[PDB]
Amino acid sequence: MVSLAQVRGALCGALLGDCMGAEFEGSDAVELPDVLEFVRLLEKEKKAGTLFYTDDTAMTRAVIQSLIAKPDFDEVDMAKRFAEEYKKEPTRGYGAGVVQVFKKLLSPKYSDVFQPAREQFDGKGSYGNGGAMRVASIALAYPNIQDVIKFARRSAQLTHASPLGYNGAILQALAVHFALQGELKRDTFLEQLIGEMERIEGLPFCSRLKKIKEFLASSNVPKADIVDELGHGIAALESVPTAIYSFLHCMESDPDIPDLYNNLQRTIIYSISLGGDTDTIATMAGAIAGAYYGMDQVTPSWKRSCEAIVETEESAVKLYELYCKQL
Ligand SMILES: Nc1ncnc2c1ncn2[C@@H]1O[C@H](COP(=O)(O)OP(=O)(O)OC[C@H]2O[C@H](O)[C@H](O)[C@@H]2O)[C@@H](O)[C@H]1O
Ligand SMILES: [Mg+2]
Ligand SMILES: [Mg+2]
């Protein structure tokens, strides 16, 4: 039985990952000591809301507003909200490509809201993680896996028309889905994901998911090896599996991370420690961790530092109602 605590956990986890990840974004070597210092300073900050969220959260909030306005899923309403949000706050840190999608939706020239995304990169569409970064809410609003899949795909295809783009969104949404279903063991969790992705792709994402299995079966896997094989890039293929690994890895102790950090905190710290697109990787791993461990692991000293923490917590209630309605 999914609880409010898990839905709120997911969203607050996504918000923390974004806000804290943003601070290290695009450094392709990050050092864990920097992350630990950052976190310690964060806990001591007397002023609340010192960390601003980025496009990841901006788009997340737009998804949520759309689901609440239109619980049956309205891709037209959603597209409009994405475009209006971009227009309202263009400097939140959007990918250079996706900006063109928003401008086409804002223009009066397109009646098919999917068409701008189809036109990206000489008709190939974006392979970026921007579809995945905002998708978690689909899993929080829709209990049935078939809904999760088709709405993850469609929400993603508003900006990401490449299969790599939108299958990454599907994968991230499935990861959050299976994290919500209670205390799944690692092996079953991955079996669940590999099962679904073979059908969906049938295989880039399955390949990476298989390597994740491999890695988890080993111990003391260098971060370099994780980055080398799974990636830490703005591409969905190189970020969504990496987020899933971070979550799965951080279900147990990491020798480098003090055990006085809880699992969700560990998850965020570890994600950021991998470098690259740290905002987006941490927001995704954080969403999965939040869903799994819930709000009890979203500590007051961490969350209070995030722009829009209050609004986010409020929004969780409305999402949770959607979820409950669907049962
Ligand atoms: N098919 C392609 N061919 C060549 N380059 C591509 C392709 N697809 C993507 N790129 C490159 O990938 C870039 C971004 O793709 P975009 O769809 O704009 O962005 P996003 O929404 O996925 O956001 C990605 C992250 O960026 C921000 O930090 C957010 O926080 C996310 O973390 C393009 O400019 C291209 O260089
Ligand atoms: Mg961002
Ligand atoms: Mg980013």
Curated annotation (Swiss-Prot):
The record's free-text note on cofactor binding: Binds 2 magnesium ions per subunit.
Subunit structure: Monomer.
Pfam family, one: ADP_ribosyl_GH
Reactions accelerated catalytically: [(1''->2')-ADP-alpha-D-ribose](n) + H2O = [(1''->2')-ADP-alpha-D-ribose](n-1) + ADP-D-ribose; 1''-O-acetyl-ADP-alpha-D-ribose + H2O = ADP-D-ribose + acetate + H(+); O-(ADP-D-ribosyl)-L-seryl-[protein] + H2O = ADP-D-ribose + L-seryl-[protein]; alpha-NAD(+) + H2O = ADP-D-ribose + nicotinamide + H(+)
Keywords associated with the record: Chromosome, Cytoplasm, DNA damage, DNA repair, Hydrolase, Magnesium, Metal-binding, Mitochondrion, Nucleus
Species the sequence originates in: Latimeria chalumnae
InterPro entries per record: ADP-ribosylglycohydrolase, Ribosyl_crysJ1, Ribosyl_crysJ1_sf
Record protein name field: ADP-ribosylhydrolase ARH3
Function of the protein: ADP-ribosylhydrolase that preferentially hydrolyzes the scissile alpha-O-linkage attached to the anomeric C1'' position of ADP-ribose and acts on different substrates, such as proteins ADP-ribosylated on serine and threonine, free poly(ADP-ribose) and O-acetyl-ADP-D-ribose. Specifically acts as a serine mono-ADP-ribosylhydrolase by mediating the removal of mono-ADP-ribose attached to serine residues on proteins, thereby playing a key role in DNA damage response. Serine ADP-ribosylation of proteins constitutes the primary form of ADP-ribosylation of proteins in response to DNA damage.
Binding site for Mg(2+) 1: D18, T54, D55, D56, D279
Marked site: Glutamate flap: E25
GO BP of this protein: DNA repair; negative regulation of necroptotic process; peptidyl-serine ADP-deribosylation
Activity regulation behaviour: The protein undergoes a dramatic conformational switch from closed to open states upon substrate-binding, which enables specific substrate recognition for the 1''-O-linkage. The glutamate flap (Glu-25) blocks substrate entrance to Mg(2+) in the unliganded closed state. In presence of substrate, Glu-25 is ejected from the active site: this closed-to-open transition significantly widens the substrate-binding channel and precisely positions the scissile 1''-O-linkage for cleavage while securing tightly 2'- and 3'-hydroxyls of ADP-ribose. Activity is inhibited by calcium.
Keyword Cytoplasm in annotation: yes
Consequence recorded when altering D56N: Complete loss of activity
Underlying gene: adprs
Residues where Mg(2+) 2 binds: E25, D277, D279, T280
Family note: Belongs to the ADP-ribosylglycohydrolase family.
